[PDB]
Amino acid sequence: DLADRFAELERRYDARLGVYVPATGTTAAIEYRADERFAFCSTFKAPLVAAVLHQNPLTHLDKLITYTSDDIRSISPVAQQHVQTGMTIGQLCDAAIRYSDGTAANLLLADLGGPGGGTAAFTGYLRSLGDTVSRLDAEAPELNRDPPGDERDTTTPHAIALVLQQLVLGNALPPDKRALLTDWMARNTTGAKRIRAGFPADWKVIDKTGTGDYGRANDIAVVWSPTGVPYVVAVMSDRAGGGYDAEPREALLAEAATCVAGVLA
Numbered sequence: 170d171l172a173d174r175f176a177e178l179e180r181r182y183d184a185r186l187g188v189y190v191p192a193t194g195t196t197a198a199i200e201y202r203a204d205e206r207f208a209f210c211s212t213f214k215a216p217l218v219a220a221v222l223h224q225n226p227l228t229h230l231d232k233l234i235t236y237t238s239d240d241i242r243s244i245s246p247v248a249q250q251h252v253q254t255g256m257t258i259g260q261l262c263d264a265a266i267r268y269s270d271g272t273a274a275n276l277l278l279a280d281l282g283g284p285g286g287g288t289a290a291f292t293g294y295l296r297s298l299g300d301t302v303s304r305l306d307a308e309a310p311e312l313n314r315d316p317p318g319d320e321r322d323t324t325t326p327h328a329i330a331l332v333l334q335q336l337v338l339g340n341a342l343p344p345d346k347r348a349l350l351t352d353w354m355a356r357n358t359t360g361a362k363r364i365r366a367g368f369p370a371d372w373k374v375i376d377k378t379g380t381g382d383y384g385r386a387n388d389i390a391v392v393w394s395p396t397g398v399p400y401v402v403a404v405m406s407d408r409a410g411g412g413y414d415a416e417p418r419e420a421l422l423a424e425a426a427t428c429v430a431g432v433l434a
């Protein structure tokens with residue numbers, strides 16, 4: 170039984186684990202704490218890029234955005250390298266997804282615009298996809314820091330899986346924009362030790378990770394079987410029991426993903 174295995178992992182890693190895989194043609198939903206709230210951490214950047222693509226014509230990807238020293242406030246591997254030239258919206262989407270660049274995500278939120286530095290418009294985008302659960306209230310670094318249990322900047326494995334399903338598998342985006350989002354997540358560099366590690370090499374995996382304080386580690390993916398059957402996999406975790414400086418444990422997500430892969434193979 171899956172739930173027993175997930176509970177064993179919780180004890181092993183002194184963690185709380187949430188998992189959701191939506192029902193398909195022949196499988197019921199897989200769900201473990203799937204309606205409990207977990208911090209978004211950086212996972213919000215995937216639907217953020219979808220919001221920015223949806224909102225604008227494609228030539229918008231070519232708009233140059235400039236920024237300065239005081240815009241660099243969070244882990245930002247790419248944005249730090251280009252501060253002297255600026256970055257296009259396309260480059261910022263690339264960096265936000267593939268390197269989880271925090272400054273890029275902040276600039277993309279500002280591009281969306283409106284109250285709360287774009288957080289309200291981001292939430293509005295989720296509402297338009299039928300997600301009445303998730304909320305973004307702050308930008309980086311603040312959004313990764315809410316105390317355990319706090320509802321600010323949270324989603325649920327259930328809600329975010331259904332969002333990602335509509336973005337990648339459904340018709341939320343036109344095919345040209347859908348393909349851009351799909352490709353960036355396909356080329357993600359931060360996810361090798363999470364959902365990807367739990368699925369065999371002949372399964373295709375696209376994903377977006379998140380990491381925070383209190384041992385927070387998430388990964389949201391779309392996976393395809395070797396025969397092209399897709400499944401959406403949302404895994405979220407925290408380790409409140411070690412306090413603010415509890416280490417995130419990637420291996421917990423790899424093992425949860427291995428357990429899901431075993432059921433889906």
Ligand SMILES: *C(=O)[C@@H](NC(=O)c1c(OC)cccc1OC)[C@@H]1N[C@@H](C(=O)O)C(C)(C)S1
Pocket residue numbers: 210211212243244268269270271309310311313314359377378379380381382
């Ligand atoms: C978003 O989840 C980002 N996370 C952070 O910047 C972060 C930590 O990451 C080391 C640790 C504690 C707090 C925060 O947020 C202030 C970026 N995305 C993650 C990820 O994709 O797993 C990175 C690549 C580790 S940074």
